[PDB]
Design a protein around this ligand. Structure first.
Ligand SMILES: *[C@@H]1O[C@H](CO)[C@@H](O[C@@H]2O[C@H](CO)[C@@H](O[C@@H]3O[C@H](CO[C@H]4O[C@H](CO)[C@@H](O)[C@H](O[C@H]5O[C@H](CO)[C@@H](O)[C@H](O)[C@@H]5O[C@H]5O[C@H](CO)[C@@H](O)[C@H](O)[C@@H]5O)[C@@H]4O)[C@@H](O)[C@H](O[C@H]4O[C@H](CO)[C@@H](O)[C@H](O)[C@@H]4O[C@H]4O[C@H](CO)[C@@H](O)[C@H](O)[C@@H]4O)[C@@H]3O)[C@H](O)[C@H]2NC(C)=O)[C@H](O)[C@H]1NC(C)=O
Ligand SMILES: Cc1cc(OCc2n[nH]c(=O)n2C)c(-c2cccc(C(=O)N3CCOCC3)c2)cc1Cl
Ligand SMILES: [Ca+2]
Ligand SMILES: [Ca+2]
Ligand code: NA
Ligand code: NA
Ligand SMILES: [Zn+2]
Length: 805
């Protein structure tokens, strides 16, 4: 109940929420149906529209008007935004030459440059170029400030998950807004875009920027605008708040536009109808900048122009129906559209079986336009699994398509032409970022980056300590003129042992065999030097990775590779090797096919054994440093050490062997050498974080050899590819992957074909950031380079996307 009979007189767009059933005059009052009786009258004035005209200049103040053109309006802070242009001979902000903002030029009483986040829904990255002729204000922000060619949203590429990621720096699995629609089985409650459940605080995890600010004594304006408040009134309200006394004035503000998303759904991303919405958003930017200029704030405020996601062509003829695949379609609930989430319709149904649903959905139609996954098998870069609101069965839908349960769902609900929500690496889903103001750089292009990084930067712009989040703080320092965050590298927690030769061959009873009994002072000294690390500078190019947790491990040196060998997991945490452009690929010689060799530096008790693999009918093994890339027949024996072996399903060995035999040399050829670091990952609870020993769900049968859930590789070379990877003077280039370690290749519908037709496609799907691998391994890479630490942080956040221009 609301007692709507109090008044909004002197309270319009009050910042503090007054407590029920007392009536409200704040922004949110419309959303809750709790506004005082006179809110529309007092707070939503529209009389005489939004612009001054010549006949209005110097008018007698009429308090009924939407905005004012009277002499007193500047001191009241309520002029129409074009007042000084029409009435005082000034120029529009957009018509002014841009001039570098070297220092904040703020009025007396301003403690810090305010931050205004101007958010636009469905603003596809390519609109910045394709719409530039119709968006002069935005084009001026972009060209004169700091801009990225695009900014990568989070998955799913929907509004609430992305706006709340902007607000928190968190992945949706961590902040809890995992879709625009959700069911939480613990609350037994459903979240929808329409309705009131979505305002309940239990949905919204983490700590959003406005709360971060308020806790640290920095006042915030509204972030969520009620849909019925016109954009012109949102801008006027922000300008009015900026005219408050110092002690009352917020330092952080947001604007939001539901365009161009609203029209893009109706017309498609490039429908001719889309020009007008882009012109209108540009006009709104112009109102804000004209308004700031009138207040003498246009060289004081930092403005961020940012989108939540892009927009793709999607029409309802491009819909896959689950009723064409499942016999039992009535026993499931599907969250449909540009992603699919499946759960049992009834928890009482003991005939429900996820395995049979996945199988019925796997590679059943030649041109099938979605792929089913158990959520733990989704690409790790999506970070889309560790939340009870994410159903165990997920459908990744091809760009331009929908999935639905039955055809009747599509016509009893072919109107729309645009949608979004797809995989966040898809080009059409990318969105925009521009920063303009004293704290941003001048006329500066920065590489694409992820929206999870922005919360830290917004905290830096406001002098706030960010709450714990998924950004990598410092990775966006290159966007900023000042206020940079200068992180220190994390301290190494575990120091390595450097074992020498400590065991005789006969101490091992591993069930392994090798035809290596093939028997020189010249070259005996050489082999000893290699085992002490004489080639390490060639193979460990950026320092050894640091281990950031407590464990027991050994550094092992070899002619062709170096490794950090875990005595706890019985395999390397990492193996590092450099392959020059000139490297030759060779075969595994016949006499060495089944060769595994005890490592006389590592105790039998801390080694794998061959008998376990013989007995485990499901599990085979592979090698981290590839025997195919040995530098000589003699060095090749090192590759068959038991300390270089890792457990691999035979189906996965198809993938790994093709990567090692074909792809590494291809990349060395293309990139002028590569340095490779490879290793296992254990993430059985799919939280994106390194498992401890007691979290491991599967072992090689009868042994203590843990089975990895994934294998990673980090492939680094010189950004200037005229220099070889091992003699690089300047910035680095990286690409990485985290491949799922699966006992079948059901994910790859073409896997019956030669690996040349499917393996690299799989690897591209599972592309990763170095930072993703760091979370999953507790390792810290690139500790010893010539490069600045913030440059290295940017490198560690890079994702090689494999999308065209
Ligand atoms: C991205 O960045 C984020 C932010 O840094 C990273 O997430 C953090 O990861 C930590 C490790 O997973 C996690 O730390 C745990 O916190 C527990 C207390 O958490 C509450 O308090 C915080 C602080 O305010 C709050 O933020 C949390 O919010 C979560 O929970 C509510 C739901 O109740 C949601 O509204 C909210 O969205 C968020 O949910 C997300 O996180 C939880 C995990 O907390 C997931 O379950 C959800 O699915 C969702 O993703 C909480 O309200 C604390 O209790 C934990 O301590 C246990 O583990 C330690 C290990 O040291 C152990 O020593 C303790 O004994 C304890 O174990 C006991 O409990 C076990 C479980 O019941 C039990 O089995 C044992 O036997 C023991 O009894 C732990 O320290 C931290 O909370 C989150 N923070 C956030 C915001 O998510 C994230 O990892 C980053 N991602 C990547 C890939 O890098
Ligand atoms: C720039 C920016 C704009 C935002 O919303 C702009 C908006 N205005 N109107 C409208 O439809 N949208 C989408 C939000 C946001 C979005 C959704 C939810 C919340 C939130 O945290 N809420 C609201 C519900 O109640 C719970 C708390 C905040 C976050 C940021 Cl960073
Ligand atoms: Ca949106
Ligand atoms: Ca884990
Ligand atoms: Na086996
Ligand atoms: Na297959
Ligand atoms: Zn939309």
């Amino acid at each position: 109940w609301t007692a709507t009979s109090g008044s909004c007189k002197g309270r319009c767009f009050e910042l503090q929420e007054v407590g029920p059933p007392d009536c409200r005059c704040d922004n949110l009052c419309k959303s809750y149906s709790s506004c005082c009786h006179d809110f529309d009258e007092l707070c939503l004035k529209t009389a005489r529209g939004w612009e001054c005209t010549k006949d209005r200049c110097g008018e007698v103040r009429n308090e009924e008007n939407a905005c004012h053109c009277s002499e007193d309006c500047l001191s009241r802070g309520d002029c129409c935004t074009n007042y000084q242009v029409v009435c005082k001979g000034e120029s529009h902000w957009v018509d002014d030459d841009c001039e570098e903002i070297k220092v904040p030029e703020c009025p007396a009483g301003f403690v810090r440059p305010p931050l205004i986040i101007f958010s636009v829904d469905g603003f596809r990255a390519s609109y910045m170029k394709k719409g530039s002729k119709v968006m002069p204000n935005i084009e001026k922000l972009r060209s004169c400030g700091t801009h990225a060619p695009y900014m990568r949203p989070v998955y799913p590429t929907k509004t609430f998950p992305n706006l709340y990621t902007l607000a928190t720096g968190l992945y949706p699995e961590s902040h809890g807004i995992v879709g625009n629609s959700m069911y939480d089985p613990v609350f037994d409650a459903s979240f929808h875009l329409r309705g009131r459940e979505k305002f309940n605080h239990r949905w919204w995890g983490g700590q959003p920027l406005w709360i971060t600010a308020t806790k640290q004594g920095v006042r915030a304006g509204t972030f969520f605008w009620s849909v019925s408040i016109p954009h012109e009134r949102r801008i006027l309200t922000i300008l009015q708040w900026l005219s408050l006394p110092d002690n009352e004035r917020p330092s952080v503000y947001a604007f939001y536009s539901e365009q161009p998303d609203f029209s893009g759904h109706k017309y498609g991303p490039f429908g001719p109808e889309m020009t007008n919405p882009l012109r209108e958003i540009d006009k709104t930017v112009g109102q804000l900048m004209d308004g700031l200029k009138q207040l003498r704030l246009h060289r004081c405020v930092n403005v961020i122009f940012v989108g939540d996601h892009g927009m793709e062509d999607v029409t309802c003829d491009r819909t896959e129906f689950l009723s064409n695949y499942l016999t039992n379609v009535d026993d499931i609930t599907l969250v449909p559209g540009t992603l699919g989430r499946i759960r049992a319709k009834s928890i009482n149904n003991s005939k429900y079986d996820p395995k049979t649903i996945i199988a019925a959905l796997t590679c059943k139609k030649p041109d099938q336009h979605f792929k089913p996954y158990m959520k733990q098998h989704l690409p790790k870069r999506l970070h889309y699994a560790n939340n009870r609101r994410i159903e165990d069965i997920h459908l990744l839908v091809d760009r331009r398509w929908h999935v639905a349960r039955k055809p009747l769902d599509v016509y009893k609900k072919c109107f729309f032409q645009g949608d979004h929500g797809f995989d966040n690496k898809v080009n059409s889903m990318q969105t925009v970022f521009v920063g303009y103001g004293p704290t941003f750089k001048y006329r500066t292009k920065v590489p694409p980056f992820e929206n999870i990084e922005l919360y830290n930067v917004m905290c830096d712009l406001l002098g706030l300590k960010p709450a714990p989040n998924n950004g990598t703080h410092g990775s966006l320092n290159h966007l900023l003129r000042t206020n940079t965050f200068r992180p220190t590298m994390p301290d190494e927690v575990s120091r390595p042992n450097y074992p020498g030769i400590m065991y005789l061959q006969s101490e091992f009873d591993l069930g392994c065999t090798c035809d290596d009994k093939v028997e020189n002072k010249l070259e005996e000294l050489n082999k000893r030097l290699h085992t002490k690390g004489s080639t390490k500078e060639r193979h460990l190019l950026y320092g050894r990775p640091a281990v950031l947790y407590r464990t027991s491990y050994d550094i092992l040196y070899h002619t062709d590779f170096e490794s950090g060998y875990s005595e706890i997991f019985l395999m390397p945490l990492w193996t590092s090797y450099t392959i020059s452009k000139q490297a030759e690929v060779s075969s595994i010689p016949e006499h060495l096919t089944n060769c595994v060799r005890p490592d006389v530096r590592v105790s039998p008790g801390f080694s794998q054994n061959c008998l376990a693999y013989k007995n485990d009918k499901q599990m085979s093994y592979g090698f981290l440093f590839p025997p195919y890339l040995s530098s000589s027949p003699e060095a090749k024996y090192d590759a068959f050490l038991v300390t270089n072996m890792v457990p691999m399903y035979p189906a996965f060995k198809r993938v790994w062997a093709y990567f090692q035999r074909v792809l590494v040399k291809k990349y060395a050829s293309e990139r002028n050498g590569v340095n490779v670091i490879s290793g296992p990952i254990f993430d059985y609870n799919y939280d994106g974080l390194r498992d401890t020993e007691d979290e491991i769900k599967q072992y090689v049968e009868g042994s203590s050899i843990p089975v990895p859930t994934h294998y990673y590789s980090i492939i680094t070379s010189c950004l200037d590819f005229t220099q070889p990877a091992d003699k690089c003077d300047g910035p680095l280039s990286v690409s990485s992957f985290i491949l799922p370690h699966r006992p079948d290749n059901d994910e790859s519908c073409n896997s019956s074909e030669d690996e040349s037709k499917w393996v690299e496609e799989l690897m591209k799907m599972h592309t990763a950031r170095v930072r993703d691998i760091e979370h999953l391994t507790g390792l810290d890479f690139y500790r010893k380079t010539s490069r600045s630490y913030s440059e290295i942080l940017t490198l560690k956040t890079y994702l090689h996307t494999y999308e065209s221009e």
